[model samples]
Target: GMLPRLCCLEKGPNGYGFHLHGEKGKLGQYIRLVEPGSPAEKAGLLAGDRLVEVNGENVEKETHQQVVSRIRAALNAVRLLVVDPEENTQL
Candidate 1:
């Protein structure tokens, strides 16, 4: 997958892997799961990551199914804009 914004996709020593969840009335697509020891975890991805965008496409107002589809359709790498609880902070 080719995530063409922010930072380049960092390939994991193991493999490119991750999981998503978007259902009901909730924030955009979120990282419901991550492969242990996978690139996702190594990159600091965690659960409850609300995806705000992907490849410059704004999906903040989208649905779970729609957001989920976006990730599944990743051609090169999964490039996304996400915010999670762990990321929430006062600085």
Candidate 2:
């Protein structure tokens, strides 16, 4: 099992280059992809990692737009707590 990891992506002039979206009725926003060589990918952000927070703000109940806005509101970098497939619970 993979441990939950904290990934901090330092914002570039263009901002973190990744897309965040939620599963149809899921709780957290999951990363869909990160642009190659972009600030996000270079900072170790990976696709499929479910974002739990950004800049210490709890986003477990936030919508896709809300999560995106929250991440964009960061000052210098985005702090993300995520649990990937390897860490997800099974019934």
Candidate 3:
């Protein structure tokens, strides 16, 4: 059977990834949910800690386009730590 996500119109990750919206009325806003296995989910990214940096660049200051540019410029898996849920086995 095909993956449910592959069939559904869900937002999935690239080689590296970002957080989805967090739970309701919670400070766990930008943090990962490890059980679901999202990237950053198990990297000790707390719910209240906003992801503000990428490759030494503070994403908070960049315009959307600039942020995309920074994301593009970043080295996959090095500048970012994209964890997998059922698939990942980190060393």
Candidate 4:
């Protein structure tokens, strides 16, 4: 099944409105929360989605803080490649 999804989000007045969590060399990073009616939800991000890439950079091996820095460096916008956990199981 096709599981990867590209989500482009524009930073809003309150920021991206999503949270990322996970540990490197453990479970890896995943979207932990997406606030309703926020940029994250508008960009199609969902909780539990496994993060693959951030702003064209592969982040599968990046530490949690590393990925956070990448996002913070973006200029008001960010692009994320993610895989739905449930869908990924079909592969």
Q: Highest TM-score, which number?
A: 4
lDDT of 3 by residue, 1-91 (tens): 3321111012236433343333344321232433345444433443333434555544443455555565556444323322233453223
User: Pairs clashing in candidate 4?
Assistant: none
Native-referenced Cα lDDT, model 1:
0.62
lDDT of 1 at 87: 48
Backbone clash total for model 4 is 0
The clash count of every prediction, one per candidate, is 4, 0, 1, 0
Order the numbered candidates by lDDT, best leading: 4, 2, 1, 3
lDDT of each: 0.62, 0.79, 0.38, 0.88
**Mind giving the per-residue lDDT tens digits that candidate 4 earns over 17-62?**
9999996458468997799999999999989898988999988778
lDDT agreement of model 3 with the native? 0.38
Question: TM-score of the candidate numbered 1?
Answer: 0.63
How well is each residue in 1-91 modelled by candidate 1, as lDDT tens digits?
3432232245455445676676676554667667787767666676677666776788877877787676557765666666654645223
Q: Per-residue alpha-carbon lDDT of model 2 for 8-35, expressed as tens digits?
A: 7887877688888788776668887699
Ranking 1 against 2 by lDDT, winner:
2
Off by over 4 Å in 4: 1-3, 24-27, 89-91
- Candidate No. with top lDDT: 4
